[PDB]
Amino acid sequence: TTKDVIQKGISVVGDLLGVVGFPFGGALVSFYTNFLNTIWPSEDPWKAFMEQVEALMDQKIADYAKNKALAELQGLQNNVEDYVSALSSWQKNPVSSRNPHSQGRIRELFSQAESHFRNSMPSFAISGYEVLFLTTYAQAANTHLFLLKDAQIYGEEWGYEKEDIAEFYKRQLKLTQEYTDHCVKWYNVGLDKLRGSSYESWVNFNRYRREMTLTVLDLIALFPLYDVRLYPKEVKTELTRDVLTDPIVGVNNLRGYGTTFSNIENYIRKPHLFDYLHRIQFHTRFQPGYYGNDSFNYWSGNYVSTRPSIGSNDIITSPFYGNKSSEPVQNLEFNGEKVYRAVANTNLAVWPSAVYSGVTKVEFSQYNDQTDEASTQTYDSKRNVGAVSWDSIDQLPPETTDEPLEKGYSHQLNYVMCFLMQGSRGTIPVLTWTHKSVDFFNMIDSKKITQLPLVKAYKLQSGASVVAGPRFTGGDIIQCTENGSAATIYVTPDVSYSQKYRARIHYASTSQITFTLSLDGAPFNQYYFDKTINKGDTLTYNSFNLASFSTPFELSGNNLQIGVTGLSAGDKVYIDKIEFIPVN
């Protein structure tokens, strides 16, 4: 259920990833038409977003509050539509038909929509309904900010005053911080409200966390890239966060035998440097049926192997998960393949006073981007397979229903972990996924501004570590606690010639520091950076600063190393991303 809003959520993020930074006019208009068809066609999508959180929370919005919200939204739709039609005409029409009279038409259509947005937002955040209105607020906030940046692109063309364009910019800065902070605060409120002790508690908790990531958190991560003044070129970026699909179970009610909340949550993957699915070792066991004829084999445990980010080749192998094999082990290798789908079969044996169920078959759909070919690899228990009961596509829809799945998919498999049920009743498999936007090669685009997340490093040092992200950066961050090296990240230049770049760093620091950059062990850039927070402080939007390094440089190597100095005992530095600006 709700796959509709999940697909809309996934698609918008996917589309926006193409018009992030300063977009080209044709691309901007194209986006807008899909945008209107997806998010702003009627009240139906808005109604579905409200029902979505009501489902997750098991609470309802007071009819009066639901109706007002919907009323504001109908009005905002007209404003957006009227604006887009006019913008479309403006782009299409030559720099001749632009008379003072048509400029004033577009200027007031814009002013109306923008103003209507500021006036309506509080309706999506009424006291006591903040969490329930989260996806609605997130989608409305996004529209408002995306709309705002147009004033910086077309402001002068439309004949706006210098003062007007400036007022709009300051307004954009204030709202980017507020809307971001609002979403994270209530996201966390909702998350904590769902923490429990039971297996059933964890499934709800994790479903909320996954659905809020796809519809809210991924979205807010793009907001800063709507600043066309800081980002005067197109931006190449990616989302590095993990999402966990619902556990694969044969029965709807485990009658208390489900793994406890703590035995799942405390054991899922902790903040880690980015990696890729490399190998899986399937362990199978025999489940006897009370009458023999109803027996079946099932997936009892597993091993998982991942390969690190580009620059390192040593394979990481996981501890054993679940129960040892009673049957012959099965190994599937993924070197180069991207698993874009997983479909499972489950089976059950009904005993006089017990029910035993397990995952009997798993079919993986893979795509080879090198040899541009799709294929499948499957796990089979070999005894009494039963029918398909779990499809990843229902939880992780494709970005586009236009193209074939091997082209339009939104996520790929990263991890597999087997949990044991209580009182040796079976095995519960749990799958972790990563976004399609992640670039394996860490490629520096010669025409765009390239954002490189530090979690894409292959090596940490001097006691640097991966820490949970503040929820608004699209992934995790690096914490530095000592003076010295911190991280080594491998970089792939896209051009052969001596292209020059400027580097920018998105960080948070308790003190004034020095960042040093090295290529293949040779320093090339060193600069002084300001303190952004006090020791103790929690990380909110304003905690981070984006600062440039003075001197331009060429990519005369691949191994980029970031080093920090100027720390005192108790000081901490958080690094989010390094950016590259193609310069002449």
Swiss-Prot record:
Disulphide linkage map: none
Keywords: Genetically modified food, Sporulation, Toxin, Virulence
Ranges in coiled-coil conformation: none
Use in biotechnology or industry: Introduced by genetic manipulation and expressed in insect-resistant potato by Monsanto.
InterPro entries: Galactose-bd-like_sf, Pest_crys, Pest_crys_dom-III, Pest_crys_dom_I, Pest_crys_N_sf, Pest_cryst_cen_dom_sf, Pest_cryst_dom_II
Record-level Gene Ontology MF annotations: signaling receptor binding; toxin activity
Top-rank lineage group of the source organism: Bacteria
Pfam families assigned: Endotoxin_C (PF03944), Endotoxin_M (PF00555), Endotoxin_N (PF03945)
GO biological process: sporulation resulting in formation of a cellular spore; symbiont-mediated killing of host cell
Note: Toxic segment of the protein is located in the N-terminus.
Reported function: Promotes colloidosmotic lysis by binding to the midgut epithelial cells of Coleoptera.
Family note: Belongs to the delta endotoxin family.
Protein name: Pesticidal crystal protein Cry3Aa
Gene: cry3Aa
